[PDB]
Design a protein around this ligand. Structure first.
Ligand SMILES: [Mg+2]
Length: 176
């Protein structure tokens, strides 16, 4: 359908664009066009309007935090994450297209394994235990908040899994 194509082209990576403006700017464009927000290292305020992203010096601004609420990000859109070196916080809230494969793709990016400190996954109805358990590759994670994930059926197993793989993790669960 047209809507499938439209979501796909919102997500598709343009590698020319990454070459021209660098990974952080290209990912910022992807996130904001898809209804997410980003916040750069050294800045208090969030980027929430695509047209107000900085034009500024080339590749200066580095994403620290991502807040994708009510966003159409999915699957291969996360390939925009590949070049980012300094992402510490990700919130995925009411991201109706996210699935386990998105979380798997993120978990395999060594750049994110090195930098990630905090993640929050809220009201993303497709996510299951499999996608959550993939997050154990974020070896530096200190905070994980899971909420309203009806597909996560075995929350006790998740707690024990993380107890072993990430003993220092503060795991906050608001799960049925
Ligand atoms: Mg939003």
């Amino acid at each position: 359908s047209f809507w499938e194509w439209l979501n796909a082209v919102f997500n598709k990576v343009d590698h020319d664009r990454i070459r021209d403006v660098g990974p952080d700017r290209a990912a910022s464009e992807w996130l904001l066009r898809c209804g997410a927000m980003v916040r750069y290292h050294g800045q208090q305020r969030w980027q929430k309007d695509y047209n107000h992203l900085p034009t500024g010096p080339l590749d200066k601004y580095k994403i620290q935090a991502i807040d994708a609420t009510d966003s159409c990000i999915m699957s291969i859109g996360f390939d925009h994450m590949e070049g980012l070196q300094y992402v510490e916080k990700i919130r995925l809230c009411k991201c109706h297209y996210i699935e386990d494969g998105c979380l798997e793709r993120l978990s395999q990016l060594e750049n994110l394994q090195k930098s990630m400190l905090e993640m929050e996954i809220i009201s993303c109805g497709n996510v299951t235990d499999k996608g959550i358990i993939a997050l154990h590759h974020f070896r530096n994670l200190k905070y994980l908040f899971l909420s309203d994930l009806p597909g996560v059926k075995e929350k006790e197993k998740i707690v024990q899994a993380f107890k072993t793989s990430l003993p220092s993790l503060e795991l906050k669960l608001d799960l049925k």
